[PDB]
Amino acid sequence: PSFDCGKPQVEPKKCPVVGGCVAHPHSWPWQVSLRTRFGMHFCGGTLISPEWVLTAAHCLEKSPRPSSYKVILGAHQEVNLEPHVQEIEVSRLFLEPTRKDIALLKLSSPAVITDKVIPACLPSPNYVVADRTECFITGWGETQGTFGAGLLKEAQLPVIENKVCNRYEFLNGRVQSTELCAGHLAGGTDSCQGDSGGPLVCFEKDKYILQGVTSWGLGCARPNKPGVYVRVSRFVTWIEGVMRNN
Ligand SMILES: CCCCCCCCNC(=O)[C@H](Cc1ccc(OCc2ccncc2)cc1)NC(=O)[C@H]1CC[C@H](CN)CC1
């Protein structure tokens, strides 16, 4: 075996995706790659239970056919998948009903939970991540010359409270209460194209809690332009309801 959610079996680097670093392999064991039937990566996701993956709804808007998608679990290299990697076809799609940028994928079979494939923990309903909390984003997205293309990367980003993120100098009112902001004022470190749908996790005493789903930004890693994430805590009741009833 039993593995606790949110507790990697390979301790992450937590280096203080553009910028950041290449992760230690299998140190973010909930990170998944959402792929076409031909195995091409197009989005991230987070394993939240053996049969359930949380991702961005925009990753699924082109096809309502679960057979258009497969989930890659336990990976480090994008291209040359490791022998233990699990490739599981999606069975059903559940888009958030108020059309927010979050969705669930039910897997056609449960993922086998191992020291390299472990779900993230969900937050408590309506939890608010406080300003300046240190969190991490992971993914196989663009690197903008910061090295590590093709390998799972991580970046440490502080949360910026919405009232600050919405100032003119930053995102000028765009951020909704069901979203959160994270990034460095000076830029240089951020999630980027190919990271959407992936996790934003924040360490709480002894485990990582999934607080955000990578959603959008005004470019990547620009100064004064932090990334925007769906605020997972505002969707926990809906997520739990989908899992309970499907
Ligand atoms: C020619 C089609 C191949 C596109 C695959 C490349 C995916 C790049 N992903 C994105 O641009 C997504 C949006 C996206 C676009 C198209 C997508 O669909 C492609 C697709 C093609 C074929 N089948 C399924 C999906 C999916 C997602 N946005 C992000 O990753 C955000 C960029 C800004 C960051 C700011 N911090 C936050 C992350």
Side-chain angles (χ1 to χ4, degrees), residues 69 104 143 146 167 181 190 217 234:
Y69 307 99
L104 283 162
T143 66
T146 63
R167 291 173 184 166
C181 293
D190 206 348
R234 288 290 302 276

Side-chain angles (χ1 to χ4, degrees), residues 36 42-43 58 62 190-196 214-217 219 227:
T36 65
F42 63 85
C43 266
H58 73 253
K62 287 167 187 69
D190 206 348
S191 48
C192 207
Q193 287 82 48
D195 293 320
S196 73
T214 306
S215 183
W216 62 274

Side-chain angles (χ1 to χ4, degrees), residues 208-226:
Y208 288 90
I209 306 187
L210 181 68
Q211 298 289 359
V213 172
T214 306
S215 183
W216 62 274
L218 300 185
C220 319
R222 293 174 190 172
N224 308 314
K225 296 287 172 281

Side-chain angles (χ1 to χ4, degrees), residues 6-14 22-31 75-76 115-116 138 152 154 208:
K7 294 182 186 178
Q9 300 301 107
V10 180
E11 178 73 359
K13 287 184 179 179
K14 302 177 292 301
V22 175
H24 287 312
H26 320 301
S27 61
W28 301 108
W30 44 78
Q31 171 77 55
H76 185 62
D115 55 3
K116 298 177 204 69
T138 52
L152 182 66
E154 72 191 56
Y208 288 90

